[PDB]
Amino acid sequence: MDQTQPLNEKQVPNSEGCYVWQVSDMNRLRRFLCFGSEGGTYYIEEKKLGQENAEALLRLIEDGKGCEVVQEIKTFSQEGRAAKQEPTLFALAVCSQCSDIKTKQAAFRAVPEVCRIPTHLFTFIQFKKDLWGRALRKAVSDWYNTKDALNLAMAVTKYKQRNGWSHKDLLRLSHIKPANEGLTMVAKYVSKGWKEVQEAYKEKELSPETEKVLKYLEATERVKRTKDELEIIHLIDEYRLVREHLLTIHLKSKEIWKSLLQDMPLTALLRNLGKMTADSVLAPASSEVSSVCERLTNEKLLKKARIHPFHILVALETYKKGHLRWIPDTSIVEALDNAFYKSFKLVEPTGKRFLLAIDVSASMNQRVLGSILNASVVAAAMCMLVARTEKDSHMVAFSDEMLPCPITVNMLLHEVVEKMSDITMGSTDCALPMLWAQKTNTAADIFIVFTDCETNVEDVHPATALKQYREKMGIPAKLIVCAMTSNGFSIADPDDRGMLDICGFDSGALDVIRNFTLDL
Numbered sequence: 001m002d003q004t005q006p007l008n009e010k011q012v013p014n015s016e017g018c019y020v021w022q023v024s025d026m027n028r029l030r031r032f033l034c035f036g037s038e039g040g041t042y043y044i045e046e047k048k049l050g051q052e053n054a055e056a057l058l059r060l061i062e063d064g065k066g067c068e069v070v071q072e073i074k075t076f077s078q079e080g081r082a083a084k085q086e087p088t089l090f091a092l093a094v095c096s097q098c099s100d101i102k103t104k105q106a107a108f109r110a111v112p113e114v115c116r117i118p119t120h121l122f123t124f125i126q127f128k129k130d131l132w133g134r135a136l137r138k139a140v141s142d143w144y145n146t147k148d149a150l151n152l153a154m155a156v157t158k159y160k161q162r163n164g165w166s167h168k169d170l171l172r173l174s175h176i177k178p179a180n181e182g183l184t185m186v187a188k189y190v191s192k193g194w195k196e197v198q199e200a201y202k203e204k205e206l207s208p209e210t211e212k213v214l215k216y217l218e219a220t221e222r223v224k225r226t227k228d229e230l231e232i233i234h235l236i237d238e239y240r241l242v243r244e245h246l247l248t249i250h251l252k253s254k255e256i257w258k259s260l261l262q263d264m265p266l267t268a269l270l271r272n273l274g275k276m277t278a279d280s281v282l283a284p285a286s287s288e289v290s291s292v293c294e295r296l297t298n299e300k301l302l303k304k305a306r307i308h309p310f311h312i313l314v315a316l317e318t319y320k321k322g323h324l325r326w327i328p329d330t331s332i333v334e335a336l337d338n339a340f341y342k343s344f345k346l347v348e349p350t351g352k353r354f355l356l357a358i359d360v361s362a363s364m365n366q367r368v369l370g371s372i373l374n375a376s377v378v379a380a381a382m383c384m385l386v387a388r389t390e391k392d393s394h395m396v397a398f399s400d401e402m403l404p405c406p407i408t409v410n411m412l413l414h415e416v417v418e419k420m421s422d423i424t425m426g427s428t429d430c431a432l433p434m435l436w437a438q439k440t441n442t443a444a445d446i447f448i449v450f451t452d453c454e455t456n457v458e459d460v461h462p463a464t465a466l467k468q469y470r471e472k473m474g475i476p477a478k479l480i481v482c483a484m485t486s487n488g489f490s491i492a493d494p495d496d497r498g499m500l501d502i503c504g505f506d507s508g509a510l511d512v513i514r515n516f517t518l519d520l
Helices: 025-035 044-064 066-079 086-096 103-112 118-130 134-145 150-155 167-173 181-191 194-200 209-221 229-240 254-262 266-276 287-296 300-306 309-321 331-341 373-391 413-421 432-439 462-473 508-517
Strands: 019-023 354-359 393-398 446-451 478-483 498-503
Touching: 019 103, 025 044, 025 066, 025 086, 025 354, 025 478, 025 498, 044 066, 066 103, 086 103, 086 134, 103 118, 103 134, 103 508, 118 134, 118 167, 118 209, 134 167, 134 181, 150 181, 150 209, 167 181, 181 194, 181 209, 194 209, 209 229, 229 254, 254 266, 254 287, 266 287, 266 309, 300 331, 309 331, 309 373, 309 413, 331 373, 354 373, 354 432, 354 478, 373 393, 373 413, 373 446, 373 508, 393 432, 432 446, 432 462, 446 508, 462 478, 478 508, 498 508
Parallel strands: 354 393, 354 446, 446 478, 478 498
Antiparallel strands: none
16 A cells, blocks of 8 residues: 555545545644745645635634634734734634624634734734624724723834725724723824824823823924934933834934844844844944844743744844845854744653654745745754754654755754755655664654655555554654645544644644653
């Protein structure tokens, strides 16, 4: 029996016509939350991949798991497990208009929490349009009324974009009734303007909290009336204004940028590394560079700034590239490598024996999350994560034959990326890691295969190779399939308790791995 034939009646043909199992709908939802469907996969066009994922979600609802889905969405968003919020927002939108009364209600109830920032709310609304009753108005009203007025003021005072997204419109369409004076004030600022706010609040008794909102709006307005660097720096120092609150002429100043650098939100810092280096703002051997390195390697700050490991991987590739042109600062490059590991949810090692196998076949050249990184690079980063936490780990690579592993656990992340950028090619035999481990009599308690599961060679099924490995070696080895796309295929036998499906770049993947490895 080989891969071109069905192991049993539950198998389905993959893109290459070979047999695998359909990953469970709940696990496909997780694959979707983590990878989305932008750019599709090597074998599946973008729109089709999105529809496949939307259909899986619809089956879940149809099967009564609607509320479980919404709970899962809230959980991923709260724990910051996914690199992008789009998939999560699309899934929430789908749930807010489905056939299940209870799921609709649960979806709407989750909008204020799942839509963490303005962009999210706007994206969520656009998806609902894609797909204003009392429920939507209440949800939107709830979103504004549950946010901190000062934080809202901070967001609405940044420069606007011509993307059709308007707070003025949402405040109107939602028929909102502001719950506190600070929100009433910001709503007035958005709908009527600064002059109106000033006039409505002159002579007015305000709590110290509402007063802070008024003084902050005043600060953002003062920015526009001056080109004096010292005055602007004082405003950044006292009110923590960011780049988007400033005039273009202000952004021409190196000192203003240094003041902006001081408390720059980590996500913005990651995006501005190259520019600030080219601009001499992050000069070699500078205290500016040192502070940056310290903020990036502070696990508590990364978590609070919701920095996902994929954000760091992408930021690193972009920065190391050097082009706008700059000399990538070596200490920052090292800091990013360090931050990558600290951004995943850390767990105690299992001390077991791991065989980590990276698929470097042709289809793995497929791009991940709309980035320039291909699936083999991303898989390599996941493999490094595991190897770094589990001392007893041996890394291997494969296509339709075992291949020398281009990476070693001691390499820095930027090196891993370089080595894996053009390594993809050839057919795919997902049974190889187990077969190779057997032939070479290498001991492993856990096999983790990083792949898209599009196996397609006339060799034994990977599930088969695992069982043969178990028997011959006398080890009850488990197989963890770390999916690298949101397709719906899996080489793991749903009927074998010793096999599990997980998803690459789920920031809490190590916890899933730990629990399965120790039957916790």
